[PDB]
Symmetry: C2
Subunit: 212 residues, 2 copies
Amino acid sequence: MRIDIVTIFPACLDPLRQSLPGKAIESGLVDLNVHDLRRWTHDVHHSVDDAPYGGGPGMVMKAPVWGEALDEICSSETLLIVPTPAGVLFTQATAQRWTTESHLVFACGRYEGIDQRVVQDAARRMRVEEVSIGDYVLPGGESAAVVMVEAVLRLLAGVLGNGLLEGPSYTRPASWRGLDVPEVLLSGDHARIAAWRREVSLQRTRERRPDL
Amino acid sequence: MRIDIVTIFPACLDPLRQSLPGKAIESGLVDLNVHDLRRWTHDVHHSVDDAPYGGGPGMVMKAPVWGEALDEICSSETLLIVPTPAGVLFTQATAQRWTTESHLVFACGRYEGIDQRVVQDAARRMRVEEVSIGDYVLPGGESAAVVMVEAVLRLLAGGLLEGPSYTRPASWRGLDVPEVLLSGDHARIAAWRREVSLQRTRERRPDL
């Protein structure tokens, strides 16, 4: 897989060179390139943003700057991802599906986001997905790209064989500060253990994620 | 606000020293301390994990090492947060509420997670919340902590989906800024924005 992330704060992507995704990249499973959007500006201030048509709060990222960057970085086989509050929700199934992609490009917004015409124009050439990692507002799309890449590269790196929430886990010691490991886990009975884990997962899922 | 994040990968928390959260911290709005969990280990290999009781794939983080860390870092006023896919969903309302907290402690788990008794023991002393930033699985809790702190410090720095934005020029690659936004008619503009927000919200997020 090849991944490009375009941003005005390249350093925010530094966790992607660490631990699990760092290993995936070193191993040649994935090429990752992080680009400073400002390199496609041509004025003295290297400005990437300007006031919104129709008024409103804040600034909008200019289309011509983004247009040039994506012209150079993307092909017609690229999947372009734009992290935004206004996107459909990112889920495990999205992550699994994106392991089949050869080229992911992340266009990380700042301010009020990116002139909408960038995505309309990009969508003439390549597939585009506007995606939110959750129902909360971040100052930019960078740490959302970190989340999404880490989800993808986890799967890509290969996970061990083993919709409910995961149950609790325990390891040594068997008793700690007057708190005991549930005797079933010490019993060696794989049937009793599996049913116990199923029971607790079910109970958790009802309490914390009734939408599931 | 004072924030501690405990982790075996401290460098993953480096984005919090940049941009908007960086400014919050420099200004003395927020103290942030990032701690390496391994500093509370006492054996030669500084081990933080061991095999799970009752079998399974992967390792579990040991309670005694987490117990010591949190003993030293937390008080009875602390809100302890454990990022985990088994948690309730993090939302804007969570973020807003957490700006009222004096002490946030993030316990970032790795592998299969943290021995459950760390949270049970902690909850004797302090408030605790197990929280998921979304329905997907990450290798560790550090990038979930980045998301959560960034949401909170954004609010500290002071229902419909956001509609599209536009800036200059008025026409670009054959694509025009919708005439209403050029019209200066605030009545027509605010009605148009409502129309499009609602249409977006239906199309992508009918749960809203």
